[PDB]
Ligand binder design. Structure first.
Ligand SMILES: [Mg+2]
Ligand SMILES: [Mg+2]
Ligand SMILES: [Mg+2]
Ligand SMILES: [Mg+2]
Ligand code: NA
Ligand code: NA
Ligand code: NA
Ligand code: NA
Lengths: 440, 440, 440, 440
């Protein structure tokens, strides 16, 4: 699956539709990023710039100009072609090929942006600019606006109104199109295949990072070169650290291992967590905690649909958690009172769900306490967990247990579609999978 | 292999030895680096900070204070311990454990650096600071020095002399200790095993990125989680691009594939290039170019020793290249004249060798034209290549061929030790390896 | 004359009237300005901040909040009272006295602005801010907006729309109220008295700076402590330099002296130029040039009225200049052709008129080529001049002559009122004045 | 009096003498400084730049290059000549005239400094630069050093050592040459004449600013166009504010007026304070305080000589003050105890003396508590004062009295020379002066 030329075009038009007449929107590419000395990390495009272009180069600026309600055009600034720079560092689109390739009206050299941008903004009433996003972008934009402000004797005028386009654009990104859902569906499959493989490869005596290696290799073979975020393999007490990425410990028989990993496929994030026994057999104590987390997920998967909210489903999860923890003697007292005192928080201290898309923690307004009513096309995670500290004052057998189980869903007209259900989460199915792998 | 506590101690003392009395050296940690929105790339410590500490956290500053020729002490600024921040983002050393763990005399909270640093610099004559390295570091250092400058009524004085420690420290890093060589030896082995595997897995119809996946998985399984640089898998004409990292093409029967990849093991870089037939059998045209590159490497491996230079060995390589290219009719004319006109440059347009260590392109002075006399303990790459453009005006059969073969060596008392010779480079050994793998 | 409490109130309301509902306007005070080391220049308030407050302290911010069409309030940030700082550097308004003194609803300490400003902007749709005016202001405003942007979990939202209030405020400043005109009338009188005095004191052998001393003393005695701009006393060839402020030469019998000087009275600028013989008697050559400049001024004073423009009156001045210069043989050819070729420009190379108010070169839109139609309440200068270079290829007697004559006017319903006519400009009246003084 | 070409030359050589071989010193001109909108304050050169050049233009950099102990040369960067810019804003030295005019070896255009400075610093070991003095200078210097650092392949090297020249240069400025003393002598005379005049002009009903006008006019007529600092005319309770510059009040019969004013003559500061009765007759209460301040000054003038310190003379002044205040019943108790408790501080809360030169509060190290031993050629102020707050709990007749009396001295071989004694300070001489003037 991919995003079509036509889709990038529609998105640009959908933004232009909302813009004032006599305005320009300025969207800047991510800078290149140093890893050490003269070596750079693999390039990751700005998600908003990518969203309108699918163009994976730095030193690029998309300028969308709305003259009026029926007239608009696009200008791209991008790197010029250069034989020496390309022999060295790889091929460039250039100005000649860009109009056709990226569907823009005009393409200019990024080296000329300070000589050209103010000319494009001259006489407009409004400029849409994400101020503070990048310092290089702010320098360029402020420099242009000052030229116009100070150039009245050359008959230049600056737009007096600057508007942040991020609220508008992030609101668009919150609702996935069919194409986006198809891409995210494949990301979920790829990510699920990686998690299945990690379960099948796990043996006591392997290191946490070995499962990371298996996962990344599986991403890569389906064409998702990079993870959407740094992979978490927390065995034992390391599972109680929410973003444990050291992955440095020997995995021990008797311990659980929590894997939080997701591929990046055509820009879009998969995001799965599975927790499982290193030796392929849950203990009673482990099952007791796992079942509470599993019921929370399964109940949330049933409940999520248009018209509810993350807040509303979270309250149901809290009830399940508090009840299960009371039955185990991890909490003590009246369930409704304990719920009212938020007594689950030492054990479940993060949110149940976040938006998912071009960023793993995706853009879009949640509303107060994540109370926003859900609608079709929203994509989100469902990730209950219970984390019992090594030194929690609870029965010994529960101490140092971290369990999270996480699926990715899209809200549909009648409910949701689970994008990550092709990797098992029921404990008996996990155990069967691992037994089968150990035979073979 | 690893670097001992004692070794980090020796390095600190070796720096203090060269410092003026009444001085402090300030070495700052790398910043955390955004990949997209709120997600960050895996953390990579500043190589110089790492060199003196082996400490892999951000927001840390090593301060080495030389009172006089027999009196010095160390102060570390690092992140305070914090239950909430660590439950979330992972464990911290803190101030209590740091003196013993990192062998420093005193550890303070990084949050207090603006309140404490000027007190440490007060009354000193000299401050060693790598000005321009990081903007956050410059802000901190300038802020301290201004407090001292302006505080004469509180009996404060700033050191009037600021010295860049990078020349001194990079000169130290240029000469590897036995421990460093042992670590780099293992990096070379790990990297060689990865390249062997890529040759064994290669089949027509696989994508360039698939070999990248194999290579990274192999790094990871020996405990080198990350590459030292972005991996290059250039098949066909992509092999003529020196830092081709797109790795996006289907590998085609008949083409060569050039793999440039290196692991990062305990901070230290492996760096190997192997070029080989996608189908496991070099053609005549491919052999003809390959043999020139192979002779260049093999001759360089013989020649490298104390008392020669990269410049001197490069001249021998140019002769081999020009002669081989004339025999193939790719160059025309008198060899000595063609050599004098640098007629190899359209085909070999980079250096033969760079320093190798904590950075793949390592620190250390090369001298004019890389004429510096080599001495024992220097570590470098040996990487001749020939790149014939798709549209070079040469016989058709050589067009679009890129071949590089690269080994890593340490200069010894009598010559060099090859750290990467455990992966094959003789064409008949390559072919045998691939045939054996294809059976299975 | 002064500006009333009520007037500052009206101006604030006139701005609020034009603001969107759900918005705040932020107006910042000028920084203190170093003259050398720890000494500072006399403090000059930002003209726009002054316009809304009449408050002459640094570290102050006026915040005007429009909740809706009938609800708005003002918050001032200003320096706290401080016994030690005031014993040293002088009295402060403080927070307690400010509401009553400056007619604001609330006053807070400037030291708390980073803790308070974002709270004031929270939930608004629009912020009016003069971006780029002051770097300290931009830091404060950007810092507030980032807190709001990043604080959605604390239920904070930033206004997405930022509007430059300068166009609106400068448009207001372009039209003087009766009070402003009364203040500018007194500035014109004070400035005229200074110019009269300089004519009366001038003797050959005095230095240019001596007339500067006389002028400044006269400003000061009427309560205008500072000039509105650096005083120009250009005798001889120095009169051909438009902003000659060195004022370092001995004034010589036979030379003209050009004086451009203006007081600052209650924030408002006077701005007069008079040119006259150092010895009190114009030569024939001097009269010949002077009369052309004088006719240009006198004609412009007749012409200026509602419905004409600076551009239109300038064309009349060009005609007068070109005709007079042709009659003297300084220009050669057909008048209409010479006019069409802009042949006056080597001799008259600046504009005839600029806006006058809180700044000598006052704010307000001029239109293309200063074609904006004039209306009652606009205040402007009328300043024709002729400057014949020492080495101009013209008859010898005109070389090195600089003459400018400048008056300040307000456009009325039927024409204009001349604010500076109490200092003489007719040559015979100048000569009489100087003769009378020499007796003284 | 003036500073000779030869003197500027000697100073440059005296600096070069102290510089390391293989080094360059970089001294930057002051920026132009905005007063309001497009109007600028009168230009004031950086005191250190002036000290080596006597050059009064912005956008200039003096570069002194020491190749070795017998070889050095100077390069000036300054503004190019420009007919249009000079017709407008005044004459420029340019590159052609600068070598001869300012005694430098070479002059280049300031517009080329980024293309030229790194070439001048290339291969040097040390750069002397006043880091933090000006942001524009730091940008230029850091930019040059980065070009050199990153240009090893073009055989460029940066000096690794940066040294602040301010300690060295300020140490030079602390000791005035005969020429400097002659210039400061004339500044003292000019300033004294201004103070005499203010006493002679003072009448009840005049405003504080009127005496400011008289003072500035007198500065100007002797060729000192500008004050060295903002003039203080504190009548009545305003005399209790140390840097009262509002000068806005009507001077009232019965009150004292404190005048602190100083001219700037050839760059050098005069600095005098005189306090006197507005009506020309001290009251008993006023005499009682005045005599203590006068005895303090007169005693200090006797004591100041080589081998004492400001600290040592200050202790004598404290004794005089505490004794006088006890006798008046303003202090109560044992003198030695009151001295030990610093009981004078509510009434005398500033230092007795500061260095005087190109800055009124001049550069140069004071030592702890201003204990540095005085030597011939040091120039300083002597300024005891007593300030009794309007609400001090002391006998009614002393409340709201501020008296300071200040003279300027140079330390000689046997004592000091008083540069400001030509204006009277004995009360009977003040009264006689004012009576004589009133007749006017
Ligand atoms: Mg356990
Ligand atoms: Mg071919
Ligand atoms: Mg003449
Ligand atoms: Mg009294
Ligand atoms: Na998640
Ligand atoms: Na290499
Ligand atoms: Na004017
Ligand atoms: Na003083």
């Amino acid at each position: 699956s991919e995003i079509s030329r036509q889709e990038f075009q529609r998105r640009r038009q959908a933004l232009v539709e909302q813009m004032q007449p006599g305005s320009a929107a300025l969207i800047f590419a991510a800078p290149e990023v140093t890893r050490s000395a003269d070596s750079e990390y693999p390039y990751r495009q700005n998600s908003d710039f990518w969203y309108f272009t699918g163009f994976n180069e730095p030193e690029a600026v998309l300028v969308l100009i709305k003259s009026d309600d029926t007239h608009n055009h696009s200008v791209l600034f991008n790197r010029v072609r250069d034989l020496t720079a390309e022999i060295w560092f790889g091929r460039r689109l250039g100005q000649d090929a860009a109009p056709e390739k990226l569907g823009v009206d005009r393409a200019l050299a990024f080296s000329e942006i300070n000589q050209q941008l103010y000319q494009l903004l001259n006489g407009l009433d409004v400029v849409y600019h994400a101020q503070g996003e990048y310092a290089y972008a702010d320098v360029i934009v402020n420099s242009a606006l000052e030229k116009l402000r100070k150039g009245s004797r050359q008959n230049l005028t600056a737009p007096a109104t600057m508007i942040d386009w991020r609220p508008v654009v992030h609101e668009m990104r919150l609702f996935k199109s069919p194409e986006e859902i198809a891409v995210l569906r494949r990301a979920g499959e790829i990510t699920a295949m990686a998690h299945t493989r990690a379960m099948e490869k796990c043996r006591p005596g392997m290191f946490e990072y070995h499962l990371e290696g298996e996962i990344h290799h599986e991403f890569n073979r389906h064409g998702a070169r990079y993870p959407s975020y740094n992979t978490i393999v927390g065995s034992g007490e390391n599972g109680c650290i929410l973003h444990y990425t050291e992955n440095e410990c020997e995995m021990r028989d008797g311990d659980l291992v929590l894997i939080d990993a997701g591929c990046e496929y055509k820009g879009y994030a998969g995001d799965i967590t599975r927790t499982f026994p290193v030796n392929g057999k849950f203990t009673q104590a482990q099952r007791e905690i796992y079942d509470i987390v599993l019921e929370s997920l399964e109940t949330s998967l049933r409940l999520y649909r248009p018209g509810t909210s993350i807040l509303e489903v979270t309250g149901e999860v809290v009830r399940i958690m508090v009840s299960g923890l009371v039955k185990l003697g991890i909490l003590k007292g009246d369930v409704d009172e304990l719920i009212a005192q938020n007594a689950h928080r030492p054990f479940f201290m993060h949110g149940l769900s976040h938006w998912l898309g071009l960023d793993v923690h995706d853009v879009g307004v949640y509303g107060q306490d994540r109370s926003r009513i859900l609608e079709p096309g929203m994509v989100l995670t469902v990730e209950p967990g219970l984390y019992i500290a090594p030194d929690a004052e609870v029965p010994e057998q529960y101490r140092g247990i971290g369990i999270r189980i996480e699926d990715d869903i899209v809200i549909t007209e009648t409910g949701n579609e689970n994008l990550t259900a092709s990797v098992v989460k029921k404990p008996e199915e996990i155990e069967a999978l691992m037994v089968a792998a150990r035979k073979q």
